[PDB]
Amino acid sequence: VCPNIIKRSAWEARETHCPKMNLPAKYVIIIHTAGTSCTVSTDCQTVVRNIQSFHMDTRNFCDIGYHFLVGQDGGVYEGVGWHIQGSHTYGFNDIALGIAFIGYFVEKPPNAAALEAAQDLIQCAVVEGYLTPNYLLMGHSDVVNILSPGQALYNIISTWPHFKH
C-alpha cells in the first residue's frame, strides 16, 4: 500500500485553493528539487516548506509545484497531494503525477530508502486508481529542457516498470 506520507500540515504548509487535478493521471514524472537534500524528518519539513514559499512568492505558482516529494530520510512528503494540479512540467501538470526527490542527483543517486519509498508510492497510485493501469513513467528531462532529475537518478528510474523506453 502507500508508504507513510507526511501531510502538509506537518510541514506547516501555507493553505491555498488551487486548480483541481483530474484523476486518473496518465503519467509519472520523476523530478529532483536540484537543491539541498535532507536526512531527517524535521530538516525535510523545512526544505519542503521553503520550496512552497519559493514557488508561490517568486515563481508565482499557486502552491508547491510537486504532488509528492521524497527525502533521504526515506520519507514521502505530501506536496499538493493527489487531488491538486501540479506546477512542475509544461503541458503535463493536469495529467502527470510529479514526484520530486529532495536533493541534487546528477552525479550521486538517492539512497535505497528514498528510491523504495517512491516505487511503493507509485505502486499504490496505480493500485488505488490515481494512475491509469497503463500509465507511463518518465524523467523530467524527457519532456522539457531541464537539468532534472539528474543523470544518476535518471539511470535508475530508467529501469523501473512502465518507463517510456
Bind-site residues: 55, 59, 66
Region from 1-9, 29-37, 71-79, 140-148 binding Ni ion, contact rule CB under 5 A: 1-9
Contact between residue 79 and residue 112 where contact means Cβ atoms under 8 Å apart: no
Shortest distance in whole angstroms from residue 157 CB to Ni ion: 18
Contact between residue 67 and residue 86 where contact means Cβ atoms under 8 Å apart: yes
Region from 7-15, 38-46, 60-68, 116-124 binding Ni ion, contact rule CB under 5 A: 116-124
Q: Does position 116 bind Ni ion by CB under 5 A?
A: no
Cell of 76: 514521502
Shortest distance in whole angstroms from residue 27 CB to Ni ion: 20
CA 99 to chain centre: 2
Contact between residue 112 and residue 45 where contact means Cβ atoms under 8 Å apart: no
How many beta carbons lie within 10 A of that of residue 124, not counting itself? 16
Shortest distance in whole angstroms from residue 125 CB to Ni ion: 10
Q: Which is nearer to Ni ion, 123 or 141 (CB)?
A: 123
Q: Does position 112 bind Ni ion by CB under 5 A?
A: no
CA 154 – CA 137 distance, rounded (Å): 11
Shortest distance in whole angstroms from residue 10 CB to Ni ion: 20
Q: Does position 43 bind Ni ion by CB under 5 A?
A: no
Binding residue for Ni ion, selected from 43, 116, 120, 142, defined by CB under 5 A: 120
Q: How far apart are the first and last CA of the chain?
A: 26
CA 122 – CA 127 distance, rounded (Å): 9
Instruction: Return binding residues for peptidoglycan.
Output: 55, 59, 66
Contacts with Ni ion by CB under 5 A lie at 1, 120
